[PDB]
Design a protein around this ligand. Structure first.
Ligand SMILES: O=c1[nH]c(=O)n([C@H]2C[C@H](O)[C@@H](COP(=O)(O)O)O2)cc1F
Ligand SMILES: O=c1[nH]c(=O)n([C@H]2C[C@H](O)[C@@H](COP(=O)(O)O)O2)cc1F
Ligand SMILES: O=c1[nH]c(=O)n([C@H]2C[C@H](O)[C@@H](COP(=O)(O)O)O2)cc1F
Ligand SMILES: O=c1[nH]c(=O)n([C@H]2C[C@H](O)[C@@H](COP(=O)(O)O)O2)cc1F
Lengths: 220, 218, 214, 216
């Protein structure tokens, strides 16, 4: 499962541990019980969600491989209850890959210049900065220092391991109109994968705990 | 990474319920920083020892385990102090607890010259435990709320819980519990955890024991 | 500031860093007068912006029964240091519920009688403990016969945001009555040190019930 | 206490709870005696008993380039609040390495030339940013053309234990030079408020190299 986001980004599911039944089992232990039947365990997940019993969902875990603009990764990395490993700018020569907003991105705003022109000015800086970047490196300048001229729309990559509860906290904040449109798109891809792996939890989440808005109108 | 079970103490156990990833999971995560991926067994295994040597612990957070543990409360209280993990435990306020208590064996006193025979100690612990539990059943039978009746049950009462923890946090756990300074009872559980860890992540475990393990019993 | 809880417990403030203004200042980095500042706090509280409150921290000294502490310690976003039963000799102090504790419940055994059976078990258990210790049994082993109502003490450092999460879960009728009592005390001290943040909490974020009543 | 770092940054102490005795009170779980207390602090540090130190907490106000903040924010056991490029118009403040930053490296061009090149692109990027803003382009979007050396500001609340882990990782020759500088400033303030913990830290637990060199 690899979903393309923006012009060169993506969200890819690397691994997963457990499913909806992992949470049912975890929660049953409190009552010294185990699993029962579909409509029973399905009903439990709904009960847990509607009453704020979040811990059982911590037993479901995902590992994603994500490609995204640094300005997006900076917001993303603010989520502390998860694990990260990202491409290093001091240890690797960075690739010429930047997020160039589509002209449609400015749709809904009165601008003095045409969207196409905006798109042009951004690319201009990008090409100029990257050119400066390579020149510095070829001149013997350390990579960790040369990359400081690169803009925030530069694409980075990282692995993200997070449990289902933290993932839902993530969705409440990023799968929402108040978050920047760009990370909203990534949150959609995360939600789609989460739905595929934990349908019962996802549904119960949208129905009883989700606090954002976009997931109620969009599909998957 | 599907199933294993080890019995601890007289009625306890550590059972592996699930696992996500393996040694290569850490290799992949670490390589991303250099914009690379997996290489060969030789180079990849070399990286794991390299990470361990210089204390690059983040890559190992991508390896996750879920255990199902049965242990006495005094052990659980020590265990639960490890904050970077997830738990769900049997509830004394919601369910009727069973007559299961950890009774130390006479050998648990080996090295300690006691006034009364060790067997005597074992017997006296069983006695108090039996009395407390009978009082518990009596209060429950008489309508006393479960959450109140259980307060008379002793610390060696067995409890059960699910524990999800990543490899990095697991190694932190072993540095502290797989050590002669930790209480013997929890050392036993730590040894079982180490056995399952070793089985699921040979390279990581081996590198851990050789370059990072701080304890003295593994 | 100290508050007695149950029959022999307590919660006392040891230290605190910051106040309502600490949250205002931290949130002001993203982008005054009492009016504008307090309005900001209600604004942050209203919209779920919890991070600014993490810059206010408390340290409590708590005395409570182990069964209460076991629930309390499940709150991971905080720091703890508790008395050790394997290193020090344990004191003869247990929580004996008052007869009023079983109020509302129709029990075959009179509430006063229930209270007595608990004290009885506690007494016998503690004697066995001392008996074992004097026989040469190490403390870490002898203490396993002691009941869950044994009192313990610990230091608790927690930020305002985490404290509010604690109040949502423990200052509620669903939580066991015993810990509800401690949560009330915790809330009282929080109110004293952070009135604006506290008022805004009850008004827009607090999910429990008892703080709206008591 | 405010220490300047790099060319336009700084580390400033906003608040602090407790001192060395706070870890002592916590470890004993009670409530003085310098000899005893200091000995205990050393004992704890020597045998890996770090929890008592979580009871000492600092709040800093930091100004640093984004590439530095991105490394800094990787420290999860702490609290942050940072200036937002989505809601605020950003100021023309960037970190321009001095020619001295590249002394010790064989470059095919004079260090001053690297300074000029970095500053030129920075200047062009900012001008575009301003033109985009004036044009009505949203801030959250207009700022994506701004380079990684843009200065940001944030409040950082962290306990002494977590602060020591930060020092271990950042106050070390392996960490990028720029964050090393911030780590030194953090250490000085820490040493100022908790002299006993700091000395015990360097003596028994500190894993980095630089702090045993440059004093305070
Ligand atoms: O929607 C937002 N999400 C987010 O995570 N930040 C955090 C990320 C970073 O630490 C700092 C600056 O963010 P930005 O420039 O994107 O506004 O605040 C800010 C926002 F406005
Ligand atoms: O010394 C380093 N410190 C650090 O915190 N990172 C993290 C920060 C970020 O999440 C990603 C890219 O860092 P950078 O481009 O500065 O190398 O890895 C990388 C290093 F090499
Ligand atoms: O080896 C130990 N491990 C541990 O986790 N504690 C913590 C657990 C509990 O929260 C409190 C009292 O522990 P105990 O009575 O087992 O000594 O301190 C204490 C020890 F001595
Ligand atoms: O209201 C509760 N609060 C709580 O923190 N637990 C946790 C504490 C402990 O880890 C385990 C057993 O709790 P208890 O026996 O008090 O029900 O579950 C359980 C409850 F029912």
């Amino acid at each position: 499962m690899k979903i393309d986001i923006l012009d060169k980004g993506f969200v890819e599911l690397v691994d997963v541990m457990g499913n909806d039944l992992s949470a049912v089992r975890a929660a049953r232990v409190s009552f010294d019980m185990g699993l029962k039947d579909e409509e029973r365990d399905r009903h439990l997940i709904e009960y847990l969600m509607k009453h704020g019993h979040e811990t059982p969902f911590e037993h479901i875990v995902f590992t994603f491989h994500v490609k995204a603009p640094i300005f997006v990764a900076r917001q993303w990395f603010r989520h502390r209850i998860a694990s990260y490993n990202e491409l290093s700018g001091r240890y690797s020569k960075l690739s010429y890959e930047f997020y160039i907003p589509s002209p449609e991105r400015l749709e809904g705003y009165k601008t003095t210049i045409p969207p196409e022109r905006v798109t042009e000015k951004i690319s201009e800086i990008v090409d100029k900065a990257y050119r400066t970047y390579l020149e510095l490196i070829e001149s013997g300048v350390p990579r960790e220092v040369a990359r400081i001229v690169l803009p925030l729309n530069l694409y980075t990559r990282f692995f993200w391991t997070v449990n289902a509860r933290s993932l839902m906290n993530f969705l409440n904040l990023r799968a929402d109109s108040h978050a920047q449109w760009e990370i909203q798109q990534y949150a959609l891809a995360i939600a789609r994968i989460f739905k595929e792996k934990c349908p019962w939890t996802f549904e119960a989440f949208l129905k009883y705990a989700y606090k954002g808005d976009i997931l109620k109108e969009v599909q998957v």
